[PDB]
Amino acid sequence: QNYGINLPITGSMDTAYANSTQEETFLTSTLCLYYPTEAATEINDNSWKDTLSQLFLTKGWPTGSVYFKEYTDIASFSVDPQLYCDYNVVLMKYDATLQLDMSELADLILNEWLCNPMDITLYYYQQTDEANKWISMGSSCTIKVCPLNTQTLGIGCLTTDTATFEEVATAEKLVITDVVDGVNHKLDVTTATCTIRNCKKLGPRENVAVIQVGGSDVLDITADPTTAPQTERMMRINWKKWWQVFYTVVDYVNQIIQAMSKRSRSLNSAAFYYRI
Amino acid sequence: QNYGINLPITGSMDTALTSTLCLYYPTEAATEINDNSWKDTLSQLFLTKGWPTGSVYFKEYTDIASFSVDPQLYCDYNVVLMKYDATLQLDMSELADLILNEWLCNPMDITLYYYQQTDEANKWISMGSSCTIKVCPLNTQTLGIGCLTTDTATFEEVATAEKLVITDVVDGVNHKLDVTTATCTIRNCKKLGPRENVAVIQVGGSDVLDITADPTTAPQTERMMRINWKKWWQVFYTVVDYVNQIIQAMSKRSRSLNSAAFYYRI
Amino acid sequence: QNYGINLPITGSMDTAYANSTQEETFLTSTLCLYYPTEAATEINDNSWKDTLSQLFLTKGWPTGSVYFKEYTDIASFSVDPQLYCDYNVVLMKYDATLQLDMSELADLILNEWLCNPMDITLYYYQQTDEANKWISMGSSCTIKVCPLNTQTLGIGCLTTDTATFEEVATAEKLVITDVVDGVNHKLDVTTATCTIRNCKKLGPRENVAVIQVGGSDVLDITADPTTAPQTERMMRINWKKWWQVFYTVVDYVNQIIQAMSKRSRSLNSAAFYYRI
Amino acid sequence: QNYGINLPITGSMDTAYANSTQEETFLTSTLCLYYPTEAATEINDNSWKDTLSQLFLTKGWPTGSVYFKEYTDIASFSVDPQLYCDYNVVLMKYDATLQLDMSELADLILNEWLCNPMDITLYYYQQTDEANKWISMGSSCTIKVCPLNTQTLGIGCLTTDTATFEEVATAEKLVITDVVDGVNHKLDVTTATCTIRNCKKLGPRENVAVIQVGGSDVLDITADPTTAPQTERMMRINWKKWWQVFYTVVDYVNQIIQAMSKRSRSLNSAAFYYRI
């Protein structure tokens, strides 16, 4: 009821635990499963959605609440990834040559970002603190940056000639650019086919989990070189058959949801902080 | 917060990324200005009012109809300069209704399921290239009233080639829906309350906005301004000069994570 | 002033924390950055060194305090890594086929080694304890080993015939050789092209950090199979452009230097123990 | 240690003497003998190293503890001398012509130095105090000096014209330049085949002893004209046969080591501590 203020909450130890709410959340929540196209191709069964829905029902979920969203690959899925379910699970196939792209995708979807628009043609942009990044997504986003000194003259580049700009992104579907803080940069972005936004990492996004299918511990969802945390929402699975992968996902849905939580930014109690 | 949301706030009566601004203006405004550097001038004029350099943003939209197709609200404060057209009144209202309020919308699969509006806060908001909403109310036996569930030509049309439309039907009644799902999408939306971080300035005309479906009320909130105009430069100068008053009418505490005009839940 | 003798130091659990010394250390210390030649090739700029120096100046490092050293590759760099700055950061590109070599390089520059000469063909050599290894470095190090029994006769090898010697390294720029302790070995090494030293791992080297660019956590700086310590001075980053890598290194230089410490063996305090 | 370096050590004047640690020192130490090529040539034996190792064993040293390093001559040895073992005895042949070179080598290896790089082409260099010298080492080190004045103009020399410089070293393998303190100088050095460093003499290096074979007391390890200290580590002997020299070294190894103090062995084998 008091939505604009952060009031302290006094809890008492020894307060009896409430019964398990897993059944109630399963009955009153929606699960989205994100898988690549090759998964469906290998499975080769036009009715596999119904089979998985029935298996989830055997596991508890009502047979109208599990959604299956298909994406071509990591690169395409990274353009405006919209996750609307109460609980989102993303099966991301591992490629040894796409480590940075997978890390960027996980950073984008495993964390909450507050993004403001960017007019590279109008303003010189600066990153204030470590939580600030430049997230750009599009069909082909190429970003070059020219740092400017206190006199607004470029460093190692000329503001007039974009050829001297330092290239940081080339033909990227998604890229999270981190430059030196407290320095103004002139930006050259292929805005005609990609959008760049100035974003802050508010914190974890608890309703999105990523299962890396058949790789190693390579995701780095933090730009700090000294930290490469492996949160509970990033799992790894060895695989040969996608049917086995989906059976493992179905059978351990309890644990997968346990690793996740309702989106803190969502729901009524988050009203008037950022959203709802 | 959430664990202290349902707690009281006691106060004594005797006791005594920074903000970003977005300006949404029609393209005809920029055409009338005819200058290719007006954005920089307005940014510096705003900086006179205390907005840092890279804070104010100018977003262009072709017209009211096109802007209504899934509008996006980007900045902390969103001042929308809407040109008035006597022939588009409802549309303007619709946009305001979708922009000055917070909505909670769920997917609608019209082909498989009938739908009803539970209460006065429930509407059906549809957006896209062109919507043609045709409605067939049913009865307790699920037979259409003045319509045939099989024959869609007897359906009652409530929207035609709408880029945005908010449909209000009789509550407690199931309706079979024919929507041009190919070219536009419909959703069951609930109005939660005001969206305090968006203000709408009507350039020219008279007070015609109606952001409430109820016929008995047409409230003009502090976030609904109106100005007479002849030159768009004067319009932008009065917007810049009185930005303090415009922000006073707004609150920065309604900027969702995403720029959408409605929360979406599956 | 009482060098060469260890004395206990007594302190209280309520002494106030002193103000941050980060600014002073940046002002009065040097930083060396080691990168591969391909980094400069990809950057495709020649003023990039000055640009990075200015960016570091924005981070508090005085102009000229940051040094940029270049190496052709891991193999060439491993011949005799000589790190002289107060703070050493080594950017090491990942290659699976070079995994062990990378580890060896890290093992050589993330730890402090007390090395004595080895004169093969005149002395047999034992490895006394866990910390004793044989570090061979040169253009091409080929080490073959012949373990001897108590009577000085080889085990599975003939002292006279080198062809029977067990071959432990072939044409290596750097190799850390660990043999069974307490057993005398006859060594056949390409002395004309390589030099082998009997080294003791005293402890970690705190002023050298290695940032592994791309790949997974594969470094193994301890010979013991049961330990693979990823210390705080071993970092990993995903990459696609070297400019982003250098911007990450500059922006988070605070964290990188925090992970590191002054060389304990060096500096005046550790005088008449080993050095200075 | 470092937290107890600036703490007092109190001892009573009645603590009983401990037993002789000479045996334990020999057991846990390594000895390095540096001799010229002419010594090996005159000996003309392929097993003299093994004979000396066995004799040292008779004198208590373990088998693989004594090492022998050969240098062509004093001038050759003076280019980056490397001191490997815990105890370093250098048999230096006497030549009446190489007196200054003998003194420079002894000064370099009998003292601990703290050296820094000099970019002679960019900066004008001065010597701060009597402990500050310029040590140049290389294949051919030709150092010419142009002193300046308060207005930066040269005196007796022109900065533009190197031919007017005051040459102080020509065709040298090692040279220790001592210029007037507090005066800025502009230096011309053959950087292609020479490296010059600004060095400070920290103090004695007690683990390096020099035995002068033949001649008289000519070593002068102090730039100060008023003092020519003969330290305990500056031995001198008279010789006719190198075998007798080595026998004297072996027999009186007790006395030689007793004149040297352990714990002065740096982690690196260099003759100076390089700092950036």
Partner: protein
């Protein structure tokens, strides 16, 4: 006699003026932008 210090620090603003005055007669030496970089190696075309 401490006033001298307090004055030396207090009146130090005038230092700026002195610098300006010393800059009045000082000659100006303005630098220009300098090309560096990957300068491509171009030569003559095959010539006979």
């Amino acid at each position: 006699a401490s006033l001298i210090y307090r004055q030396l620090l207090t009146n130090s603003y005038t230092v700026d003026l002195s610098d300006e005055i010393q800059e009045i007669g000082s000659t100006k030496t303005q630098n220009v932008t300098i090309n560096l970089g990957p300068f491509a190696q171009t030569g003559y075309a095959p010539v006979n």
